[PDB]
């Protein structure tokens, strides 16, 4: 909101930032990512 | 025997016990100009004792210099009469 109000060039875009993240297993488990699953749900290959 | 303390002494004021003419007329000329008068005032100002302060307060209220508004024991509250 502040940026749009203080911006010249209305309508503009506010573009995005893109980076592909590679984590190791240890870091991903520590960072509240792929945490841990039951023996049966380990086989679940889909996302939420 | 370790105490675990500091034990810093004080200055030990020597408030007066009995008065003379100099303290008396100082009282009589200085209990006015005081908007609030009580034992604490007559000890943090003029260095008389608290007993002398009680007696002097009763005396001055006898004459009429200080006006009372509540004379509850352990806290006497007087103002100056104008």
């Amino acid at each position: 909101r502040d940026l749009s109000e203080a911006s010249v060039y209305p309508e503009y875009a506010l573009p995005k930032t893109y980076n592909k993240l590679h984590y190791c297993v240890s870091c991903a488990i520590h960072a509240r990512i792929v945490r841990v699953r039951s023996r049966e749900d380990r086989k679940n290959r889909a996302p939420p | 025997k370790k105490k675990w303390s500091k034990k810093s002494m004080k200055d030990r004021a020597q408030h007066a016990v009995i008065l003379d003419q100099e303290k008396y007329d100082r009282i009589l000329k200085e209990v006015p100009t005081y908007r609030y008068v009580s034992v604490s005032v007559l000890v943090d100002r003029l260095k008389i004792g608290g007993s002398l302060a009680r007696i002097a307060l009763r005396h001055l209220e006898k004459e009429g210099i200080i006006k009372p508004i509540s004379k509850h024991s352990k806290q006497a509250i007087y103002t100056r009469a104008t």
């Binding site: - | 025997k1 009995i18 008396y24 002097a56 005396h59």
Partner: protein, 145 residues
């Protein structure tokens, strides 16, 4: 509501019974400084001498002080009822005294001497420096000296 100014014969520390008694404090608790004289005894003798207790000790007369001293030195002569006394039915003569400044220490000491030379339990206890009134010594009087 009494304000008398004063006349400058007031005296600070005075002397009686070989005790530097303080002025500038009321006579009862001033006289309490005298070993052998407590609040009750001093209040009573200052009542019997008919000196005002509202007066500070430094503001008093030599005749009043001498009257008070005479009373405390022979109190039973002035209708003191013989149970205010610290040494009554003494141990030797059977009369009733009231010890004072240095006589208190001397009398305590000769009592301890009597018990020690008698080899009584309390005397042996006093000599060893322990408790004598039957207290427990297991947890108290550790750094007693």
């Amino acid at each position: 509501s009494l304000v008398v100014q004063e006349q400058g014969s007031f005296q600070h520390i005075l002397r009686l019974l070989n005790t530097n008694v303080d002025g500038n404090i009321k006579i009862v608790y001033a006289l309490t400084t005298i070993k052998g004289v407590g609040r009750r005894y001093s209040n009573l003798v200052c009542k019997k001498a008919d000196v005002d207790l509202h007066k500070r000790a430094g503001e008093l007369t030599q005749e009043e002080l001498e009257r008070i001293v005479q009373i405390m030195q022979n109190p039973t002569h002035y209708k003191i009822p013989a149970w205010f006394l610290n040494r009554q039915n003494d141990i030797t003569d059977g009369k009733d005294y009231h010890t004072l400044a240095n006589n208190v220490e001397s009398k305590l000491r000769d009592d301890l001497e009597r018990l020690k030379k008698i080899r009584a339990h309390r005397g042996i206890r006093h000599f060893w420096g322990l408790r004598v009134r039957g207290q427990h010594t297991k947890t108290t009087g550790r750094r007693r000296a």
